[PDB]
Design an enzyme around this catalytic site. Structure first.
Site, PDB file in Angstrom:
ATOM      1  N   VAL A  41      48.945  35.339  37.505  1.00 20.17           N
ATOM      2  CA  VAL A  41      49.607  34.234  37.059  1.00 20.17           C
ATOM      3  C   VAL A  41      49.997  34.559  35.452  1.00 20.17           C
ATOM      4  O   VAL A  41      50.867  33.921  35.118  1.00 20.17           O
ATOM      5  CB  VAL A  41      48.082  33.330  36.870  1.00 20.17           C
ATOM      6  CG1 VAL A  41      48.359  32.104  36.212  1.00 20.17           C
ATOM      7  CG2 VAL A  41      47.735  33.107  38.348  1.00 20.17           C
ATOM      8  N   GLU A  55      46.224  21.436  34.769  1.00 18.30           N
ATOM      9  CA  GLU A  55      46.675  20.991  36.005  1.00 18.30           C
ATOM     10  C   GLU A  55      46.804  22.237  36.692  1.00 18.30           C
ATOM     11  O   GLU A  55      46.631  21.934  38.068  1.00 18.30           O
ATOM     12  CB  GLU A  55      48.311  20.401  35.680  1.00 18.30           C
ATOM     13  CG  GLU A  55      48.971  20.227  36.854  1.00 18.30           C
ATOM     14  CD  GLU A  55      48.413  18.810  37.603  1.00 18.30           C
ATOM     15  OE1 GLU A  55      48.345  17.797  36.989  1.00 18.30           O
ATOM     16  OE2 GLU A  55      47.768  19.017  38.782  1.00 18.30           O
ATOM     17  N   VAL A  94      44.122  23.064  39.880  1.00 16.27           N
ATOM     18  CA  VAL A  94      43.941  22.455  41.133  1.00 16.27           C
ATOM     19  C   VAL A  94      45.341  22.558  41.877  1.00 16.27           C
ATOM     20  O   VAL A  94      46.188  21.614  41.401  1.00 16.27           O
ATOM     21  CB  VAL A  94      43.384  21.141  41.207  1.00 16.27           C
ATOM     22  CG1 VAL A  94      43.186  20.676  42.713  1.00 16.27           C
ATOM     23  CG2 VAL A  94      41.871  21.179  40.305  1.00 16.27           C
ATOM     24  N   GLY A 145      49.154  37.422  47.444  1.00 17.17           N
ATOM     25  CA  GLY A 145      48.430  37.143  46.180  1.00 17.17           C
ATOM     26  C   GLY A 145      47.747  35.653  46.034  1.00 17.17           C
ATOM     27  O   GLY A 145      47.488  35.391  45.048  1.00 17.17           O
ATOM     28  N   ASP A 158      35.616  28.227  45.961  1.00 11.14           N
ATOM     29  CA  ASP A 158      37.078  27.834  45.379  1.00 11.14           C
ATOM     30  C   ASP A 158      37.406  26.333  45.665  1.00 11.14           C
ATOM     31  O   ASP A 158      37.499  25.581  44.735  1.00 11.14           O
ATOM     32  CB  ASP A 158      37.925  28.638  45.896  1.00 11.14           C
ATOM     33  CG  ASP A 158      39.398  28.560  45.132  1.00 11.14           C
ATOM     34  OD1 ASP A 158      40.525  27.983  45.738  1.00 11.14           O
ATOM     35  OD2 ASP A 158      39.595  28.669  43.766  1.00 11.14           O
ATOM     36  N   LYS A 160      37.438  23.307  43.019  1.00 11.22           N
ATOM     37  CA  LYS A 160      38.450  22.177  42.770  1.00 11.22           C
ATOM     38  C   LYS A 160      38.008  20.799  42.960  1.00 11.22           C
ATOM     39  O   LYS A 160      38.589  20.171  42.152  1.00 11.22           O
ATOM     40  CB  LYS A 160      39.553  22.743  43.661  1.00 11.22           C
ATOM     41  CG  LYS A 160      40.225  23.961  43.150  1.00 11.22           C
ATOM     42  CD  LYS A 160      41.294  24.517  44.005  1.00 11.22           C
ATOM     43  CE  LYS A 160      41.848  25.921  43.690  1.00 11.22           C
ATOM     44  NZ  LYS A 160      42.394  26.580  44.768  1.00 11.22           N
TER      45      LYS A 160
HETATM   46  N1  LIG Z   1      46.366  33.916  42.450  1.00 11.18           N
HETATM   47  C1  LIG Z   1      46.449  32.492  42.414  1.00 11.18           C
HETATM   48  O1  LIG Z   1      47.394  32.293  43.376  1.00 11.18           O
HETATM   49  C2  LIG Z   1      45.948  31.629  41.466  1.00 11.18           C
HETATM   50  C3  LIG Z   1      45.053  32.033  40.657  1.00 11.18           C
HETATM   51  N2  LIG Z   1      44.518  31.113  39.442  1.00 11.18           N
HETATM   52  C4  LIG Z   1      43.396  31.452  38.972  1.00 11.18           C
HETATM   53  O2  LIG Z   1      44.283  32.091  37.621  1.00 11.18           O
HETATM   54  C5  LIG Z   1      43.134  32.915  37.241  1.00 11.18           C
HETATM   55  C6  LIG Z   1      43.723  34.442  37.362  1.00 11.18           C
HETATM   56  O3  LIG Z   1      44.312  34.763  38.662  1.00 11.18           O
HETATM   57  P1  LIG Z   1      45.197  35.982  38.781  1.00 11.18           P
HETATM   58  O4  LIG Z   1      46.366  36.047  37.739  1.00 11.18           O
HETATM   59  O5  LIG Z   1      45.618  35.980  40.293  1.00 11.18           O
HETATM   60  O6  LIG Z   1      43.911  37.410  38.610  1.00 11.18           O
HETATM   61  P2  LIG Z   1      44.767  38.900  38.469  1.00 11.18           P
HETATM   62  O7  LIG Z   1      43.644  39.868  38.442  1.00 11.18           O
HETATM   63  O8  LIG Z   1      46.116  38.924  38.731  1.00 11.18           O
HETATM   64  O9  LIG Z   1      44.645  38.676  36.853  1.00 11.18           O
HETATM   65  C7  LIG Z   1      43.371  38.771  35.921  1.00 11.18           C
HETATM   66  C8  LIG Z   1      44.110  39.272  34.533  1.00 11.18           C
HETATM   67  O10 LIG Z   1      43.003  39.166  33.508  1.00 11.18           O
HETATM   68  C9  LIG Z   1      42.716  40.499  32.810  1.00 11.18           C
HETATM   69  N3  LIG Z   1      41.306  40.542  32.922  1.00 11.18           N
HETATM   70  C10 LIG Z   1      40.468  40.191  33.642  1.00 11.18           C
HETATM   71  N4  LIG Z   1      39.212  40.264  33.350  1.00 11.18           N
HETATM   72  C11 LIG Z   1      39.337  40.650  32.138  1.00 11.18           C
HETATM   73  C12 LIG Z   1      38.366  41.133  30.950  1.00 11.18           C
HETATM   74  N5  LIG Z   1      36.902  41.108  31.552  1.00 11.18           N
HETATM   75  N6  LIG Z   1      38.422  41.805  29.975  1.00 11.18           N
HETATM   76  C13 LIG Z   1      39.821  41.825  29.516  1.00 11.18           C
HETATM   77  N7  LIG Z   1      40.914  41.248  30.451  1.00 11.18           N
HETATM   78  C14 LIG Z   1      40.593  40.960  31.904  1.00 11.18           C
HETATM   79  C15 LIG Z   1      43.465  41.479  33.956  1.00 11.18           C
HETATM   80  O11 LIG Z   1      43.719  42.815  33.371  1.00 11.18           O
HETATM   81  P3  LIG Z   1      44.417  43.758  34.415  1.00 11.18           P
HETATM   82  O12 LIG Z   1      45.509  43.544  34.929  1.00 11.18           O
HETATM   83  O13 LIG Z   1      44.346  45.062  33.199  1.00 11.18           O
HETATM   84  O14 LIG Z   1      43.498  44.081  35.436  1.00 11.18           O
HETATM   85  C16 LIG Z   1      44.766  40.806  34.426  1.00 11.18           C
HETATM   86  O15 LIG Z   1      45.561  40.933  33.450  1.00 11.18           O
HETATM   87  C17 LIG Z   1      41.893  32.910  38.053  1.00 11.18           C
HETATM   88  O16 LIG Z   1      41.204  32.142  37.380  1.00 11.18           O
HETATM   89  C18 LIG Z   1      42.517  32.506  39.424  1.00 11.18           C
HETATM   90  O17 LIG Z   1      41.186  31.756  39.866  1.00 11.18           O
HETATM   91  C19 LIG Z   1      45.076  29.878  39.716  1.00 11.18           C
HETATM   92  C20 LIG Z   1      46.117  29.374  40.561  1.00 11.18           C
HETATM   93  C21 LIG Z   1      46.683  30.400  41.632  1.00 11.18           C
HETATM   94  N1  LIG Z   2      42.581  31.681  45.855  1.00 10.52           N
HETATM   95  C1  LIG Z   2      43.047  30.315  45.590  1.00 10.52           C
HETATM   96  C2  LIG Z   2      44.247  30.215  44.142  1.00 10.52           C
HETATM   97  C3  LIG Z   2      44.736  28.912  43.967  1.00 10.52           C
HETATM   98  O1  LIG Z   2      43.954  28.231  42.984  1.00 10.52           O
HETATM   99  C4  LIG Z   2      43.644  29.486  46.764  1.00 10.52           C
HETATM  100  O2  LIG Z   2      43.729  30.408  47.819  1.00 10.52           O
HETATM  101  O3  LIG Z   2      43.989  28.358  46.778  1.00 10.52           O
HETATM  102 NA    NA Z   3      48.120  21.144  39.903  1.00 12.01          NA
END
Ligand SMILES: NC(=O)C1=CN([C@@H]2O[C@H](COP(=O)(O)OP(=O)(O)OC[C@H]3O[C@@H](n4cnc5c(N)ncnc54)[C@H](OP(=O)(O)O)[C@@H]3O)[C@@H](O)[C@H]2O)C=CC1
Ligand SMILES: N[C@@H](CCO)C(=O)O
Ligand code: NA
Ligand SMILES: NC(=O)C1=CN([C@@H]2O[C@H](COP(=O)(O)OP(=O)(O)OC[C@H]3O[C@@H](n4cnc5c(N)ncnc54)[C@H](OP(=O)(O)O)[C@@H]3O)[C@@H](O)[C@H]2O)C=CC1
Ligand SMILES: NC(=O)C1=CN([C@@H]2O[C@H](COP(=O)(O)OP(=O)(O)OC[C@H]3O[C@@H](n4cnc5c(N)ncnc54)[C@H](OP(=O)(O)O)[C@@H]3O)[C@@H](O)[C@H]2O)C=CC1
Ligand SMILES: NC(=O)C1=CN([C@@H]2O[C@H](COP(=O)(O)OP(=O)(O)OC[C@H]3O[C@@H](n4cnc5c(N)ncnc54)[C@H](OP(=O)(O)O)[C@@H]3O)[C@@H](O)[C@H]2O)C=CC1
Ligand SMILES: N[C@@H](CCO)C(=O)O
Ligand SMILES: N[C@@H](CCO)C(=O)O
Ligand SMILES: N[C@@H](CCO)C(=O)O
Ligand code: NA
Ligand code: NA
Ligand code: NA
Lengths: 331, 331, 331, 331
Positions: free
Chosen positions: A14, A121, A124, A177, A191, A195
């Site tokens: 993200v 936004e 969800v 992903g 999850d 939401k």
């Molecule tokens: N994947 C999806 O489809 C969606 C996800 N989300 C939400 O967005 C958020 C992120 O998801 P996503 O990007 O897939 O997760 P990722 O693991 O891809 O990203 C997490 C990021 O946060 C950094 N990070 C995590 N924990 C720590 C910590 N304790 N200290 C410092 N840095 C940290 C990670 O570092 P590093 O990369 O070095 O490990 C990474 O860069 C979550 O809340 C998820 O619920 C929302 C909508 C869609």
């Molecule tokens: N794991 C979540 C990402 C979207 O927030 C899903 O599958 O809908």
């Molecule tokens: Na939305």
């Protein structure tokens, strides 16, 4: 023209997509009077492969108090919470996609949501309109809400209908992903429940507790169960429901048997379906997960902020339910 | 010399450490007249750099029924469950480090645990003796058990004691490979609860339910709370307790105030402290997380198997506690 | 049976391939009486993606003096030099693929080479026999040596003959992992010159200075030049030559016009061609670059060491040239 | 608003920083009536995570002739040369940070430098003013020039001053993205020599040959040598010198003993110190390596171009030195 100083928390799927989206669309931002300037991106491995320039990476927390905006997509609860609270206290807005944080730390975050400092936004149905959709729905009073709010389990159930196994489909979903870091949050309905709780707080009750959501996932489902459904002209989906019961709002997540031609059974992606008074029956559908879908959402919120609109406010007061109409067929 | 045919589920921090430990120790295995042969290794992404041969990587599920052993370290519950059940039905043992699977799918897995088919030393305190420690403690009747079972949250409170923040500490624990994929499991006490449940079932009640464990994490703790504790002569730790209350076994996880000289307070790694009659007071401590630490446990179990010993058995009956007890004071 | 404690310097394409080769073939090693135990692997990014378990990675230098063997494939000169010298001084052998180090730090490394502590088969033509080949050639006295010692420029010239451009071919060569970190060392003949120098020191003159090699690369070559060659029944290759001139050994690297049916023009990979008295005309060919090819070489050397054979010794004394026969057609 | 069409060669530390800087500064470019459009970005591996859009990535060479500017940051000499020449022949400018290309292929590139087509501020001391600094210094006649032009080796001697080792220091400089791909170029003084050559050509002799620079690196230096220097009131640095000897300009790179109060000794970043008549004594210092530092230089040059100014011109004739000089004492 002014600088928009952005602190980004999280540089994963993200976070990276959002970074690159913000710079790719900086011309759009200039029409809003700003130039985007990232202060830093909090991550774990600052040296590994990643779609953000290495020098902007920060492996340790950094001061957020000179930012104009904090954007968070770190995942989890208590760590992002402790990172964003000083920024919120200083009146700096938060744009987040983090549904767990908002659902499970609302005691700390509600007062800032009420002041219009939290834009979520993307938390969800990603950048599919969901919160905005319910903001417009507030013209009416809810009778029933049903959503398909988790993309991973949708994908799994769609693949299982086609005869693929749970475990095959999950693996693919993780590769695309879609899944949370731990897929249990997806497959056990949690999850979806995070939401659903946020939707309830926007529309019907600003104190709605996450703990009151009754959640059950897709663990009893198999390609056989789904094929038997199809033969009855049904589809099984994991559905997130909000409805009145004895004078209260009730929230549940569970697999449900739907008529195959119902909007929820057909929909292309995540979907939110509502019946409301006096509008009638409305729905919205689109991608509910993924980097680019979520970045869309976060960037929508940034434009919202830049135009002078406040964040997503909780309902001003709990609303009275109109219908006792608890619907349902479980599986 | 006969093939010991292993199906490995998972190729991550643990699965990789295990795979490489097996290869490095292949001489040691010839002493039982076997040579280790991996039938395949299940992974999500066959493209990542990995210390396992490309040609053994499987992105999709593969037939397990020719294996002599399934070793599982994939994470989650339902997916590993559906993959290991057919092997277990066929009388193929499982060696696992997956505490969540065991804790949350015990209705399905108990029957096979009872037949000696499930080895899970690495599921609690990694390769530090914990299940074996309790197997020996069965010579006495349990009075009370208290453990520091979550490596990530020990690490966090140890780092916070020295003034570091929660977020920093957490970030570092994730980097060290200690955290569950979802760190919330670590920090809200759920992972300790999973482990606590498995200790209860081994020792005092083979049906003890995970849902009966009462669990609260470290979210109310700061470097300030812990530094005030130091000045009262105390250390605060997250402690997993099993003790008698009203003639039933109670299981709880919560921050507790310990005297600073207590074994549990002075433990640098994870720790399990038991009082039992007639043995008295016994204690074990060592690393409770990490790839190598965990691989040691899995390999200990593979050697256990190869020597002719069965897996870890649940307690042969439930029994009430001997004495009414009580954990330390909360925070 | 004893432990063979290995310190590995470098965890890149070569280092990783060697790590995994050593563990994959640990059964072979047990027939030599040893079990391989890596002490650690020196790298730059200990947390990124890599085909070695993360916990074995060391981002900073570590004490080598309890190793039984140092294996180096770091690249460069002065840094590996300073890391290996204390180990050499303590009588710990070095296995290296690092031709630059050996060519450019021979004043420091020669005395240890003379005591049989340096194994470097992999430093010329990877695990294709080259140093061993010249060790057997020492039965005879060299008349002329010509080699195709750089895989990157071979690949480029083969691709350019097929009409592909320099820049296209180089890009592919870099992707295949053939090139040095900086490709200039390949394309300007320097890497060939490092290799040629080591060959000269084995066979003809143990003090041969790298600076005396006259080196010119492939920068004047184009698909047109090569097509014109073909039309004359010739191939152009970068060739590394060793030959007598007025009573001295002379070493050169340059593009040369070869008859198309000459072994050097045809050969499948890197090639070393010799005419010697009294043996006659001998050659060897095989892959001269790549992770797996190089790991083969390093592992050959480890087996050499384990069988009780010493490393690659310099010629005991400069040998007199027999022929003044300076050959050649340049381009 | 017209397109400014850029072909970018290289997508690494520098090319990525540049690409992202361009996007972030797109508002600033509208002030010249342009919008930046990248025609393509040449890279080796389109698969790596990269902060540049997948769809602009090219793994093979692409037509450059529609570009308004070629920006090059690919590394090496011959390959970038063959790619930029056709653009230069067509009157398309080049903006480059590639000191090796300029130093080593000047016979081909000089004619186009003379026409104002080559911008290379970022080729010496990154975006710190160096070429512009000398362009202003052309108002006087040079007496002598001395600079600390290699960021990696400054960093290493600074770290060694504090007791760290060479190898540690080097490893850290590589991690910071300061080192040439081949670190030998940094530590044997060759990269300083490349830069020195370009300063000579700008100031005093437009044909000055790279081969005339006499260059020796830091391989004889230890934390002990530098700490002994501190006690004599001296700092040792690698210094690039241009000075008169026997009526000819001499160019040398070598460790020199500096008085500790000298500007060159007290410089925390790279530094250029000039004495010229009639100005006197002038000095510039700032970061001489890093992605962002380098991108600043390239973008400074893009703004130079867009403002209507030509590139960096060689000196309009050679001329002998005014005064006989001498560098500081060696080590
Ligand atoms: N994947 C999806 O489809 C969606 C996800 N989300 C939400 O967005 C958020 C992120 O998801 P996503 O990007 O897939 O997760 P990722 O693991 O891809 O990203 C997490 C990021 O946060 C950094 N990070 C995590 N924990 C720590 C910590 N304790 N200290 C410092 N840095 C940290 C990670 O570092 P590093 O990369 O070095 O490990 C990474 O860069 C979550 O809340 C998820 O619920 C929302 C909508 C869609
Ligand atoms: N794991 C979540 C990402 C979207 O927030 C899903 O599958 O809908
Ligand atoms: Na939305
Ligand atoms: N880390 C630790 O300290 C300890 C962990 N454990 C437990 O061991 C288990 C594994 O943990 P760890 O190795 O840290 O986890 P990792 O995520 O590091 O490894 C998970 C591995 O399983 C693969 N994988 C993950 N999900 C799936 C899926 N649905 N289908 C197929 N393959 C999958 C991954 O493939 P890919 O690599 O392609 O992503 C990866 O190789 C967990 O149950 C954890 O609780 C136990 C004790 C200690
Ligand atoms: N590629 C080939 O075909 C062949 C190469 N060789 C030789 O083998 C050697 C290595 O080549 P190759 O594996 O391709 O190179 P790679 O860059 O793939 O590997 C270099 C390795 O060394 C580590 N490293 C490098 N410099 C330092 C430093 N200053 N401090 C700490 N760690 C460091 C790197 O860390 P990190 O990964 O973190 O960057 C990496 O793990 C070279 O001498 C090359 O000449 C020999 C035969 C064939
Ligand atoms: N780093 C620094 O401090 C500074 C560097 N410079 C110079 O800038 C230039 C680039 O340096 P830096 O970015 O650090 O180098 P990087 O290796 O980080 O980037 C090189 C880039 O060019 C691509 N590439 C490399 N070789 C080729 C080839 N033969 N064909 C096509 N694409 C290629 C790579 O593709 P891929 O990413 O797929 O590997 C990569 O994107 C160099 O000349 C360096 O001397 C100048 C000032 C400062
Ligand atoms: N996250 C777990 C893994 C070890 O079981 C812990 O911290 O204990
Ligand atoms: N760059 C080297 C690697 C082999 O030593 C080559 O191309 O031959
Ligand atoms: N390696 C170079 C890059 C900057 O030109 C240095 O250290 O100066
Ligand atoms: Na254990
Ligand atoms: Na060889
Ligand atoms: Na500059």
């Amino acid at each position: 023209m002014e600088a928009l100083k952005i602190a980004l928390l999280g540089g994963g799927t993200v976070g990276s997509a959002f970074y690159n989206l913000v710079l790719e669309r900086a011309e759009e931002l200039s029409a809003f009077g700003v130039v985007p300037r990232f202060l830093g991106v909090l991550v774990r491995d600052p040296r590994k492969p990643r779609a953000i320039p290495q020098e902007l990476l920060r492996a340790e927390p950094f001061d957020l108090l000179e930012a104009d905006l904090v954007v968070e997509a770190m995942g989890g609860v208590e760590a992002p919470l402790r990172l964003v609270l000083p920024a919120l206290e200083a009146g700096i807005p938060l744009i987040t996609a983090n549904k767990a944080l908002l659902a499970e730390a609302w005691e700390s975050l509600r007062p800032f949501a009420e002041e219009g400092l939290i834009y979520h936004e993307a938390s969800v149905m990603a950048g599919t309109p969901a919160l905005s959709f319910l903001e417009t729905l507030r013209g009416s009073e809810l009778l029933e809400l049903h959503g398909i709010l988790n993309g991973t389990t949708l994908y799994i159930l769609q693949e299982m209908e086609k005869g693929r196994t749970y475990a095959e489909a999950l693996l693919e979903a993780q590769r695309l992903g879609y899944a949370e870091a731990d897929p249990t949050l997806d497959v056990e309905g949690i999850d979806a429940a995070h939401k659903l709780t946020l939707l309830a707080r926007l529309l019907v009750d600003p104190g709605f507790p996450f703990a009151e959501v009754e959640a059950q996932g897709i663990a009893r489902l198999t390609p056989e169960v789904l094929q038997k459904a199809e033969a009855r002209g049904e589809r099984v989906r994991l559905v997130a429901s909000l409805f009145g019961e004895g004078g209260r709002w009730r929230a549940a997540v569970a697999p449900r048997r739907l008529p195959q031609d119902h909007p929820l059974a057909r929909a292309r992606g995540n979907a939110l379906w509502v019946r409301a008074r006096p509008l009638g029956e409305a729905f919205v559908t689109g991608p509910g997960a993924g980097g680019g879908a979520t970045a869309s959402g976060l960037f929508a919120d940034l434009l919202r902020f830049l135009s002078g609109a406040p964040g997503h406010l909780p309902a001003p007061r709990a609303r009275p339910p109109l219908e006792e109409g608890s619907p349902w067929p479980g599986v």
